[PDB]
Every structure is written in C-alpha cells, then in structure tokens.
A paper describes a structure:
Here, the ligand‐free crystal structure of UMG‐SP2, a metagenome‐derived urethanase with depolymerization activities, at 2.59 Å resolution, as well as its (co‐)structures bound to a suicide hydrolase inhibitor and a short‐chain carbamate substrate at 2.16 and 2.40 Å resolutions, respectively, is reported. UMG‐SP2 belongs to the amidase signature protein superfamily (AS family), which is characterized by a highly conserved GGSS(S/G)GS motif and can be found in bacteria, archaea, and eukaryotes. SP2 shares the domain architecture of amidases, with an α/β‐fold containing 12 prominent α‐helices, 12 β‐strands, and five larger loops. Structural analysis and molecular dynamics simulations reveal that the flexible loop L3 consisting of residues 219–226 is crucial for regulating the hydrolytic activity of UMG‐SP2.
The crystal structures of wild‐type (WT) UMG‐SP2 (GenBank Accession No. OP972510) were solved in a substrate‐free state (SP2, also used as an interchangeable designation for WT UMG‐SP2 for simplification, 2.59 Å resolution) and a complex with the phenylmethylsulfonyl moiety of the suicide inhibitor PMSF covalently bound to the active site serine 190 (SP2PMS, 2.16 Å resolution). The structure of SP2PMS was solved by molecular replacement (MR), employing the structural coordinates of a structural model of UMG‐SP2 created by AlphaFold2 (AF2). The remainder of the suicide inhibitor PMSF, PMS, bound to the WT SP2 clearly illustrates the topology of the active site architecture, with the amides of residues I187–S190 forming an oxyanion hole and K91, cisS166, and S190 representing the catalytic triad (left inset). The primary active site cavity of SP2 accommodates the phenyl and nitrophenyl moieties of the suicide inhibitor PMSF and BBC, respectively, through a set of hydrophobic residues including W143, W382, L400, L319, and L323. In SP2 and SP2PMS, K224 (part of L3 at the perimeter of the secondary active site cavity) interacts with several water molecules and H215 (as well as S222 in the SP2 structure). These interactions consolidate K224 pointing toward the substrate binding cavity and blocking the secondary active site sterically (right insets). Due to the steric blockage of the active site when empty or partially occupied by PMS, substrate accessibility (in particular for larger molecules) is limited, in contrast to the complex structures with one or two BBC molecules bound. The overall fold of all structures is highly similar, with root mean square deviations (RMSD) of Cα atoms between SP2 and SP2PMS or SP2S190A of 0.2 and 0.25 Å, respectively.
Residue numbers in the entry: 14 to 453
The structure:
Amino acid sequence: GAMSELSAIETAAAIAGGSMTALEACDAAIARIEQRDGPINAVVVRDFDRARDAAKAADAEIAAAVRKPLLGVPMTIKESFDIAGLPTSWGFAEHADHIATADSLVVSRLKAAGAVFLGKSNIPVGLADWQSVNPNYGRTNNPHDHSRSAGGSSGGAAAALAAGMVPLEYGSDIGGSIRVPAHFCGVWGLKTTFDAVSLEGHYFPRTDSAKADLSVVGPMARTPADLALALDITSKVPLPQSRIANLSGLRILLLTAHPETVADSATISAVERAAAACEASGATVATSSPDLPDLSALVADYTRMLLVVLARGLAPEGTEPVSLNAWYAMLDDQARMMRAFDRLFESFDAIFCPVLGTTAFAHSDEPDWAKRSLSIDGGIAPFAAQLGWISMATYGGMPALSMPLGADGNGLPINLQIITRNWSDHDAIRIGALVAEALD
C-alpha cells in the first residue's frame, strides 16, 4: 500500500538498532489511535499512561544491552483477555466494571517478550457475533467501509490492524472469530490448532471459566512473519517450524463450494486465482478428493456441539438437556471427524477455500442469526449457513490461516482460508507467505 506502517518485527528492529526509542514507538501508536479511531471505534479500552511507563522501562532494558523479540513493540489485545488493572466485560453492561487482577497467559507471554500493551479492542456482547458492538463501548466500523461490519468477535482487533494503529493483536475463535474479522478487514489471522495455546485469562467475566472445546486463541497481524513470532511466543510448547521452502510440489485441495452454503462470484474467483498462482509456481491443485469428509454431516455435528458448549449444557426450560453420557459420545464423533481429516492430509498439504461466502455485510441490529440474511450476487441467502466455511478447522481442530487476497467490486477485502493438518500451524503461515509472494 501507499500508506504503510512498521510491522511488529520491523518496530523491534528499529528499537534494537536505535533508529527510534520504545517511547517514540509507543507515542507514535497512541497518536495513530487518537487520530484514526474516531470513525472506527476499535480501541475501546485505553491504558496510555501505564503504557508509556512500560515503554520507558523497555528503553531502560535496551540501554542495558537487553534484546527481546518484541521489546518496546506496542500492541493491543481483544477485550476478552485479562490485563491486570483493565476491565474484562465481554461487552456486558453488568460486567463493565469487572477489573482483572492478573494478566492472562497470552498477555504475560507477550510482555515477557517485551511487548507494550496500549489497551484492548472492541467485541460483541458475549463474543457471540460476526460484528463488534456492545452497550459498553459502541460499534466498531470497518475501516474499508464505515457502513459495514468490522467482523467479530475479534472485530476491533482486525479494524485496528487494518487502520494501521498497532502492528500486532491477538484474538479468539470458536465460530470463525479470528478468521472472519481478518477477512472482513483484510488483515492476517491465524486460527491455531485446538489446544496449542493456553486460554488462561480468557475468562468469562467474574469467573475462571474458559471454554474447553472448539475455541482457540491466535495472533492477528499484517504480516505472516509477525504471526509466526507471536505464535512461538505464546505457544504452550514450541511448535514445529515449517520446512516448506517454496510452492513447488505442494498439494492443494481447492474448494469453492459447500453442500450447505454458498460463495459469491468475486470470492470464488479470488480463491481460484490464488490456486492458479500456486499452480504457476509448481504446486499441484485438486478440486475434489474421495477422502474429503462429509461437510454436510460436519456442520450439523459442529453446530450441535457449539450450541451445547455455548449453553454450558443448559437446556431451555421444558426441553431435556444433553446427558453427560451423550456428550462423551459427541466427543467420540468429533474425534472420528478429526481422524478423517488426518487421512485427507496424507494426500494434501493444504485446503484452499473461502473464509466466508461474501465480504463484510452491512451493520445488523438483529441479534437472532435465524432472522438475518445476506446478499450473494444480488440474491438473498441465509446468514447462519455461512458457518459451514469455518466449521472444518474449528470442529476438526486444524489450524487455519485467513490472509488477504484482494477486494471485491466495492473495495471490500476478500481473504483466503488456508487449512493445514493439526499442529502444522507454522506450515499454514508459511504457505500463506508463499501464496502472497506468488500473487505479486
């Protein structure tokens, strides 16, 4: 782009080399937020006074010859992550004054690498939407078109990255809440392998309960290099690095259709263009496989588990809740689906497919997804069916990258979803980096 910002790694290098100080990096980011966040409303919790103190402490370490991978790099994090001294509300008015007393694990890891947290980014109520709007902070608007959703639930994070306010962010994903905002705002987002990164401190307000199923946390940035560094900083253990040097020989499964939902022409064309660029770089592309799992059964099973997980096994009055024994059977079903993808990835290195079937939708005041619809090539389509596109990685557990491809006819970003086998998170990042090179 013509107007650019330093990446997270470039900022740390500029501080380590002495071309700028950590306090200057912090003050520059504070200025971008105050200058740009007016019409976007992404950074809704601000901690600028304590951040400047941390930036000064970072410059103290720099002078003492200390070097850390993110030393002095300013960032924000999704509001649902605990930071000691800041509220964690999940957009609930009842929890607006719930102040965390300890940093979450991800925050602690990033701080130990030297990062400076300026504040936290906006979310929908209960993290339960592909928008970012709540009565505590208001609505986040897509920086590419203020009339469209920024995505959710990590939508404030993606908007702050798209507007260049900070180079690094971190979100959570149970129904696409990392991939979808990255796609709506045209930035990079890694849905990580299930259980690869600790959710400690991503607590429902006033509890120490984090989701034990489907949900993952993962980095968001504007470069694949920043994603890989942030992944290595926050992983439970160091994950296998990628040995993929180029696209020659890579085996890609290209999917632009789903038995339970649809993609529009611009999205289909964009995902196809990415596969063709890899084919021109020596990769092999298939458009079907007998080992592809039953995507229709997958979305139905994923949805039943998702609803149970979201309700904590509570049923509406009158109806009978799912029994614990039935829950154990559901996990067996999921494990069986995970192994089906294992077999698929014996033949393929990656699946290429849409993140969602269309670009960022107009702001919706309808809280019930069953009462929402979407425009696909001027045609009306069901909203909730779009869950099919993100269900594979969430239910199967695979890592999935959301990376910029381009924009549609209205300038709204379109991202590609790159799905690789469990624990190959660095492959997903690396393939995305190679795809971006192949497109330029």
